[PDB]
Symmetry: C3
């Protein structure tokens, strides 16, 4: 038609021909256990629904044409047990990374990020950086970033907790991260600096081979109500878009996941924001040398 969108970029005959490979992980586990709502397992389907519909490939506002990129949907990870599921997810993400392609994983709960981080650690031995964009720390004794901070080959100096909220983070949890030389960038600090500026600082710390992990409950619930654990304050939709674009254009960002989208909580506005976030990553990615 006269307005080609993301759907039009799925021109890859086979997965191997794609720049960016989408992988779904339809499992609840994550913030639901921290008082949250069940339903994140429906995130990949809701994301797909709007993936079919949104995102002008040539954006004349940002002046970026993403026409040359090829996307591929590898479908959902399927398994009879959550443990097998985690294993299959890790293995899949690794194979995509190993051939130099970019895996984007749509969840599903936070727990997906542990297998995703492990694929990273395997693919770039001893040279991974990780940012967790999250209103929560996700480090309770398990939580995905405690699992990764406990990895021998991962340097905590290259771990950033981004847009975390003091009202939602235990002293013991902050202490654990900092004792591992990790960095806390509180919401107030991100707001003060500007979200993109602060994320630039974050990527400076994470360095090469960065896992950009985006828990969407880091967004204020006024923009992003449909998450397992809705935030009273947090990132705006525009800040999220702007951050996603930066991550897209930053050559050191080697994979992304997106956790906690929960259509049982809210099913129309929130999945659209999620797709628009991915869309901005795709535009940024289009500008990579």
């Amino acid at each position: 038609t006269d307005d080609p969108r993301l759907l039009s970029l799925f021109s890859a005959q086979r997965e191997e021909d794609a720049d960016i490979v989408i992988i779904g992980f339809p499992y609840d586990e994550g913030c639901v256990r921290n008082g949250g709502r069940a339903g994140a397992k429906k995130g990949p389907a809701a994301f797909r629904f709007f993936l079919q519909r949104l995102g002008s490939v040539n954006n004349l506002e940002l002046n970026v044409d993403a026409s040359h990129l090829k996307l591929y949907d590898a479908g959902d990870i399927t398994a009879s047990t959550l443990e097998e599921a985690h294993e299959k997810l890790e293995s899949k993400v690794f194979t995509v990374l190993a051939r130099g392609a970019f895996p984007f994983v749509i969840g599903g709960g936070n727990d997906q990020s542990a297998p995703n981080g492990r694929a990273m650690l395997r693919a770039f031995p001893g040279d991974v950086g990780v940012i967790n964009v999250d209103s929560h720390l996700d480090v309770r004794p398990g939580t995905p970033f405690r699992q990764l901070l406990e990895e021998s080959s991962f340097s905590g100096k290259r771990f950033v907790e981004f847009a975390c909220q003091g009202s939602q983070c235990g002293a013991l949890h902050a202490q654990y991260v900092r004792d591992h030389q990790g960095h806390l960038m509180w919401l107030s600090e991100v707001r003060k600096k500007g979200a993109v500026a602060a994320l630039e600082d974050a990527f400076g710390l994470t360095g090469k081979n960065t896992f950009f992990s985006f828990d969407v409950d880091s967004l204020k619930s006024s923009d992003m109500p449909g998450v397992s654990c809705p935030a009273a304050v947090g990132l705006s939709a525009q800040e999220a878009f702007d951050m996603c674009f930066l991550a897209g254009k930053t050559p050191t960002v080697m994979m992304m996941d997106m956790s906690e989208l929960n259509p049982l909580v809210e099913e129309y506005r929130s999945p659209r924001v999620a797709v628009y976030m991915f869309y901005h990553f795709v535009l940024g990615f289009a500008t990579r040398p």
Copy 2:
């Protein structure tokens, strides 16, 4: 009582005695066809409900007393066919314009703006300007602003697309407008300048006899969820109010319409925002020499 509101301004015996005449257009057609939801036809009723209830006529915050203005509700345009409806709407708006009064048209979908623009072109031959405040371009091969850009007597140099969004606008659509010498003012640009400042610039371009056309899906859905095509990002409610006040006080603005209000999507918060927008236009209008 001790707090006179908009309702109190409906003191006109007959329509001819009114400064501002309200006309309803209860038809869905507009963004519903671009993936949107049916229900905009219920906008005029929902608008009326809160019209009866809101808006202090003497506003001590802005220090504007709208007591001297007379409003009149001419009711809804009724017809057995959408085509006849468009014809009747155009004819009605024209008669209001022709006697020097101000028509405000509450929709209803975007399609209303084509008949509204035509009434303008008839009333001010070869000397009309038009601004479309819209997250979308509304120019697909039909869409109301393609119809008006195809009018012989309309100069595209005096057409502004205001607060449009790059994620939602085809390259072919931008190209069409610009090839007609029309102007795109992207949301990011409006945000950067300030909404009122940018609208001042817009009115500078539209010039005399300006049609101020406000598609409310230009507002972020956090403030304005009840529209056929809810926006993830967009104008805030305050920006919309501030813009409406400016339009009210700008003597070159000769009519206004308001499209896409959809109470089937959300029925309480959004119609209130719509009435408050009209209310701010009325305060601004009160200050016209």
Copy 3:
């Protein structure tokens, strides 16, 4: 556990051992009569639900540890008539004030603030200040702040209407307050100065023995939908949190109430904001000398 929250502060054996005493007032009366929705009577229960769940006692973002404070829930005021209820509320708040402890009253509608103000006037004869944080004036011929402005011992020079909205305030109502030497700080003015800066100015006017009265319909409905009279524009959640923290740390603030929380309108996001507001007051209070 590894993340102690507000619940952990309820260590007071008996009420007398508490720094802050929570009192519930489960009655609708307030903005419901100004076109609002019934249901504020459910506010205290909804507030309690999230009180059990939220708020890190040691906040590493703000670097305030509220561990030393003792909270106590005195339950709800119960009575066979609204009039008796008002009497019991006043009496209870007074006894808490009289022994130097801090009463926090969760409503329930605006009408609670009249008995609350009276307890203040009794406890600090002729030396009370009052701020009403409210999108509305609450002064109609009755409304709680007309009742207090009519008190012989109360100086209107020490009454501030904060974040009021011109679109929602009659000229006669503004006139009444100003004729009593009261001060109007319009939303636009609060926004221009910064919310905390403006509240500092307000506390400068209210002076000693200030009643901090927070009608949550002063918050924009994008953040705070669950109120009897939802606001199109207003304070953000962050502004409210920031204001509550300031009030907590300001030694002249001797009690607080919180009115208009309405879970019938919206039951999850809004009570969380209410608890987070109280939470910020508690952190601020923790820093009092």
